[PDB]
């Protein structure tokens, strides 16, 4: 029922290789709809979903100049953070930025986000109150102070509670058949003998959306978490997701193990046995 829009930015310095690499992507729930690549020839915001390409040139021109502004902004951050950590010019470093908004079942504002990362580590993050910042190290304390004096959280809160959710509601309406759908997972179970006394029972979940799903193995009602091989939800390439969980079952006890699937598309949670 709840929905969310997310923008992800990744800036990677390329020492001795020219300008830094900038890649920006946009997501509505688990569906990507826009992209930008600093190495691409178009140098424009490009559609990545069938429901967003219909937007006129005013939309794409506005998104293009803004994502190019973010590219220039992050390029300055690469030098600013280098000076904060007293680093050289030959080192390749990565800056990551994510912000967006979440809405509830009533499509009303729920949560806002705006956080940064440097070389895979948390740097600065807007707290839930949308008025304070969490700075990990001392270098991020400098950024928090500059953002406090410039009142960056005030303008960000206006965007997260306004423009973000207003267009998060707008994309949901234009892509109702794509974003407002709920595809129940197609489930099936697989059996393979590893020896004459052990067999692997694999529970499959296919063609479901959103990606949030839970596959658990139970033996007579007891959770087999430590013995369950559970892969992360993976994209199929068509807008749907996949996931499976496997357990090693001694030959003859297949009737003792059950698979449980929970997803928004299912009217009731499923219980799967090999029978």
């Amino acid at each position: 029922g709840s929905h969310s829009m997310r923008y992800f930015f990744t800036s990677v310095s390329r020492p001795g290789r020219g300008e830094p690499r900038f890649i920006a992507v946009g997501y509505v729930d688990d569906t990507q709809f826009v992209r930008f690549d600093s190495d691409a020839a178009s140098q424009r915001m490009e559609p990545r979903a069938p429901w967003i390409e219909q937007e006129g040139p005013e939309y794409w021109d506005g998104e293009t100049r803004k994502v190019k502004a973010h590219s220039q902004t992050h390029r300055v951050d690469l030098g600013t953070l280098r000076g904060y950590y007293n680093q050289s010019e030959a080192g390749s470093h990565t800056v990551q930025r994510m912000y967006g908004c979440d809405v509830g079942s009533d499509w009303r504002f729920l949560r806002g986000y705006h956080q940064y990362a440097y070389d895979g580590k948390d740097y600065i993050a807007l707290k839930e109150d949308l008025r304070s910042w969490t700075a990990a190290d001392m270098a991020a304390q400098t950024t928090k102070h500059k953002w406090e004096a410039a009142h960056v959280a005030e303008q960000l809160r206006a965007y997260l509670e306004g423009t973000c959710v207003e267009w998060l509601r707008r994309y949901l309406e234009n892509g109702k058949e794509t974003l407002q759908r709920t595809d129940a997972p197609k489930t099936h179970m697989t059996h393979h003998a590893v020896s004459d006394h052990e067999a692997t029972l694999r529970c499959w979940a296919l063609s479901f959306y959103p990606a949030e799903i839970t596959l658990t193995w139970q033996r007579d009602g007891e959770d087999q978490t430590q013995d369950t091989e559970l892969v992360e939800t993976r994209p199929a390439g068509d807008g749907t997701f996949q996931k499976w969980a496997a357990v090693v079952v001694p030959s003859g006890q297949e009737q003792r193990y059950t698979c449980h699937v929970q997803h928004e598309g299912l009217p009731k949670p499923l219980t799967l046995r090999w029978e």
């Binding site: 923008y7 946009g26 939309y59 506005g62 998104e63 803004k66 994502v67 502004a69 973010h70 902004t73 300055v76 951050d77 600013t80 953070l81 912000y99 940064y116 740097y123 600065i124 950024t143 500059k146 953002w147 960056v152 303008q155 960000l156 965007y159 423009t163 973000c164 267009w167």
Partner: peptide, 9 residues
């Protein structure tokens, strides 16, 4: 839609 504020670290 993206944000238009130029937020610098």
């Amino acid at each position: 839609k993206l944000s238009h504020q130029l937020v610098l670290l």
